[PDB]
Design a protein around this ligand. Structure first.
Ligand SMILES: C#CCN(Cc1ccc2[nH]c(N)nc(=O)c2c1)c1ccc(C(=O)N[C@@H](CCC(=O)O)C(=O)O)cc1
Ligand SMILES: C#CCN(Cc1ccc2[nH]c(N)nc(=O)c2c1)c1ccc(C(=O)N[C@@H](CCC(=O)O)C(=O)O)cc1
Ligand SMILES: O=c1ccn(C2C[C@H](O)[C@@H](COP(=O)(O)O)O2)c(=O)[nH]1
Ligand SMILES: O=c1ccn(C2C[C@H](O)[C@@H](COP(=O)(O)O)O2)c(=O)[nH]1
Lengths: 316, 316
């Protein structure tokens, strides 16, 4: 059924992945090299075997599409996928006051009592970013995320290349190039990088009315990472295709290091004893059009009938 | 037998490729998305069904590995894979004298009589680049090729990032990152680009002594392009692996637009009536070591037993 590529991967890892020590200690079973496909005219790859939140991944996506770096947008649409970072930018400066922030989430899922001091420290700052403007302006900014990457690349003669923008106009302009590419890997930077872009590069291809997209992703967490990345890039594609007036073909995903966390071997097994239910569908607001002004109500998802959800340890 | 991935692709295109007009008019049958693998401990992917020249692709590779852009190196090791470009840089300036260069190779494979005026114009300049220094210095330079891309990325505060260099030291330093990446797509540039890097990105992965490499290539010519690209990236890998003291696992190739030229449908068929002979082998000079000073005699290839070769029209 559409999402079966992930199960064939989830299996295949558990099954022939090597034990690698990751950037922490956490065991990972790994595959290097895999490509996987989904025919978006037949449906949406939200996994129906583990409920995934659409509201969460759409808000983040649009905030990417808005060239926005500031962690505030998200806070307005109670999304918290990017906070932990701004906190290190915050706890590290000369203004941080009070406590032992000195690790916060790395001793949350097991700790101390951290969740009353890390999460109160955290809510106080998340609450601050949402109201104090000079504050927002200060720590909530994050810098180089995919929004700045995609919509305003930094150039060698001080400007800003809206790489994406230009690639959607390149589609209208002529269907055919092997050059409809939006990179997010900037070699200059990855010295001073927080989280390097995982979903390192992509490419679009028009072909007789079906748009398609290929994503090269340096690494995958096949439990928490991959369910949300397969969807983000499918919403982008439905959104990029409706802007330059096309219809939608497939989505193709290519990973460098797909790996599943040694913490998560139990929990995948749990999904693998499930048996898929049909794919959800997606209404794309048909009067609205310059996709950078898609507002959240313009992407209403229909028919999402998921299984219950599984409990992960944090990917450290 | 090792090279069978290409035949399964060559077939598969002829067989389910769409007719696309390319950047010229030339018909192409296309596949978008494919990944293909070769276990370099079992041999070398020089096609034994169409003789491919190793001498040619090694010289070019080392000149890449030397951060060299100047078309001269090549001329010394009678390689001509990059001349046509320097000629447009040459014919376009205020110094070009004499003739109708006004298209040269685009009316060579069918023309005029071009091959006496284009090829004499061309040999006169190829001969000039090899001796006139201020000349070499002038038109033979080419600029942004993979050598400048890989060994000296241009930075926003006027310097030079030896991206590759740093990635081979990252291997010695620690086997494991999902961050052993050398991009060659610089969004700033591809306005003013001659030929954008086709083999857009790659990534290495150590895993218990086998190094491996994954190449994302925006487009492929599955007749002339692909035979030489599968090898270039396998020599790099044998060369990158012997430098940071590893052994060699697989090579994985991922293409955006693989396509085979409509001119070449006859000629692939010809290869497909052949039946492979075992894979060649490769001696990597075992006293020599900082791979940027690999000289050509240090990569002696052993056992190359090819079929005869097929005749292509130029990929325009
Ligand atoms: C997403 C995104 C971008 N990001 C950034 C980000 C940065 C480094 C990473 N590192 C690793 N190894 N894997 C990741 O998933 C990851 C994600 C995320 C941020 C937070 C969450 C998160 O807290 N939510 C989990 C929920 C699972 C659970 O706790 O029950 C999620 O899957 O969303 C996920 C992704
Ligand atoms: C290689 C490389 C980099 N390059 C640069 C380069 C630039 C644009 C391109 N455009 C397209 N569509 N395909 C290409 O192979 C190609 C190659 C090359 C330059 C010259 C030759 C060439 O003249 N030699 C062919 C020989 C086939 C024949 O004529 O019999 C070859 O395959 O080498 C090939 C590649
Ligand atoms: O939404 C996301 C964000 C991150 N990652 C990953 C995969 C790797 O485990 C790590 C990024 O690579 P490293 O930094 O460990 O090299 O975080 C994902 O899978 N999905
Ligand atoms: O060694 C090389 C160099 C170039 N190309 C290609 C593939 C495409 O046909 C074209 C580059 O893409 P476009 O410029 O047509 O988009 O040249 C290869 O296959 N191999």
């Amino acid at each position: 059924m559409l999402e079966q590529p992930y199960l064939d991967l989830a299996k295949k890892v558990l099954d022939e992945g090597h034990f690698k020590p990751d950037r922490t200690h956490t065991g990972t079973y790994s595959i290097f090299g895999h490509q996987m496909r989904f025919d978006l005219s037949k449906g949406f790859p939200l996994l129906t075997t583990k409920k995934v939140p659409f509201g969460l991944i759409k808000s983040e996506l649009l905030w990417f599409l808005h060239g926005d770096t500031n962690i505030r947008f998200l806070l307005q649409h109670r999304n918290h996928i990017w906070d932990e970072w701004a906190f290190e930018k915050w706890v590290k400066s000369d203004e941080y006051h009070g406590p032992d922030m000195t690790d916060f989430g790395h001793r949350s899922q097991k700790d101390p009592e951290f969740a009353a001091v890390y999460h109160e420290e955290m809510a106080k700052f998340d609450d601050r970013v949402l109201h104090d403007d000079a504050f927002a302006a200060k720590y909530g900014d994050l810098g180089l995320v995919y929004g700045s990457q995609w919509r305003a690349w930094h150039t060698s003669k001080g400007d800003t290349i809206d790489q994406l923008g230009d690639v959607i106009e390149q589609i209208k302009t002529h269907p055919y190039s092997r050059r409809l590419i939006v990179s997010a890997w900037n070699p200059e930077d990855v010295p001073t990088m927080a989280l390097p872009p995982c979903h390192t590069l992509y490419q679009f291809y028009v072909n007789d009315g079906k748009l398609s997209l290929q994503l090269y992703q340096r690494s995958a967490d096949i439990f928490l990472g991959v369910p949300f990345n397969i969807a983000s890039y499918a919403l982008l594609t439905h959104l990029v295709a409706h802007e330059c007036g096309l219809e939608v073909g497939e989505f193709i995903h290519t990973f460098g290091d797909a790996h599943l966390y040694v913490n998560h071997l139990d929990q995948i097994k749990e999904q693998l004893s499930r048996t898929p239910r049909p794919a959800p569908t997606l209404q794309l607001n048909p009067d609205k059009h310059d996709i950078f002004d898609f507002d959240m109500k313009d992407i209403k998802l229909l028919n999402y009938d998921p299984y219950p959800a599984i409990k992960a340890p944090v990917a450290v």
